[PDB]
Amino acid sequence: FKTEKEFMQHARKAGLVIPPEKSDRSIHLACTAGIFDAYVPPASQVSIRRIKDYDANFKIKDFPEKAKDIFIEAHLCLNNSDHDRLHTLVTEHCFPDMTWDIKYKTVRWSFVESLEPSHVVQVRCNVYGQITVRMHTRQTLAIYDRFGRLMYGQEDVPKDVLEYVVFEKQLPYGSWRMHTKIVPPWAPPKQPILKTVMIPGPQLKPEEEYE
């Protein structure tokens, strides 16, 4: 199937009555479906108070330093495929979106010195703190294959990366972890690919035509 309506209509046509049963335990989520306020890039001390009243030892003047080490160390966990550290470093909205398509291929990301200082942009808020940070770095990539042949990026050459990384904290034992990464609509296209792609047209059954 493709959705829940297709399964419930198929379960009604079949006769599968699935009773919605009452259970006292639910799912204890630690993330958010996306971003609270979509920071569209080129006064939120409200939410800084609404963070410090829970955390009470929190200096924003030290945080994009910390946001650097949450960023970079998480990306080095892709070089080894260490998922158990990534769950401390990254949120669960962010973990599949960075580790799923990279499965069964080796990546060799590396960091080199930033062009700009990283600096925090905005802060928003059972309670989910959410901090977007601007990072302007120089990174290196080489995404290989199952067969160890290069499919993205020269390994030595550093490239300049803009990164509007959104962090999130649960507000008891949690910390700041990468939640998402905003890419602005004005951004240039990424590196081109080493291979070529055929993109199929409409598969025509005999009764229809191409127009």
Partner 1 sequence: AAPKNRRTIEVNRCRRRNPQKLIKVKNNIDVCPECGHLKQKHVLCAYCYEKVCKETAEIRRQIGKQEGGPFKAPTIETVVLYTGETPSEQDQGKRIIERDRKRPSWFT
Partner 2 sequence: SPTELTEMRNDLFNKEKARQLSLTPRTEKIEVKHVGKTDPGTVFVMNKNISTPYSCAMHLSEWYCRKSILALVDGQPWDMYKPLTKSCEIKFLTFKDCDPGEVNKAYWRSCAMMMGCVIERAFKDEYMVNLVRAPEVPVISGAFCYDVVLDSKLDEWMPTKENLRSFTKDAHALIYKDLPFETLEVEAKVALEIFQHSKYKVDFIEEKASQNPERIVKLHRIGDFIDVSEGPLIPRTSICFQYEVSAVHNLQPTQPSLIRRFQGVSLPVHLRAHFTIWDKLLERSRK
Partner 3 sequence: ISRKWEKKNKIVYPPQLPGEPRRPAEIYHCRRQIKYSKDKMWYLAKLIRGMSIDQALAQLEFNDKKGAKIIKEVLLEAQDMAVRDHNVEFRSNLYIAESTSGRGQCLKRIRGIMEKVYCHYFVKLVEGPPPPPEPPKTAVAHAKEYIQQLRSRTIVHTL
Q: Which of 197, 206, 207, 208 binds partner 2 (CB under 8 A)?
A: 197
| Number of residues near partner 3 (by CB under 8 A) | 17
Partner that binds at residue 207, options partner 3, partner 2, partner 1, none, CB closer than 5 to 8 Å by kind:
partner 1
Q: Which residues, 136 to 165, sit near partner 3 by CB under 8 A?
A: 142, 144-151
- CB contact at 8 A, 94 and 194: no
Question: Nearest distance from residue 191's CB to partner 2, in Å?
Answer: 9
- CB contact at 8 A, 153 and 142: yes
Fill in the DSSP letter of residue 90. B
Applying CB under 8 A, does 193 fall inside the site for partner 2? yes
CA distance 170 to 23: 24
Q: Which of 19, 42, 201, 206 binds partner 2 (CB under 8 A)?
A: 201
Q: Measuring CA to CA, how many Å separate 49 from each of 21, 38, 208? A: 41, 20, 63
> Which backbone phi and psi does 58 adopt, to 5 degrees?
-160, 110
Applying CB under 8 A, does 206 fall inside the site for partner 1? yes
CA distance 64 to 130: 13
Please give the residue ranges that form the binding site for partner 3 (CB under 8 A): 104-106, 108, 142, 144-151, 195-198
Positions that interact with partner 1 (CB under 8 A): 206-207, 209
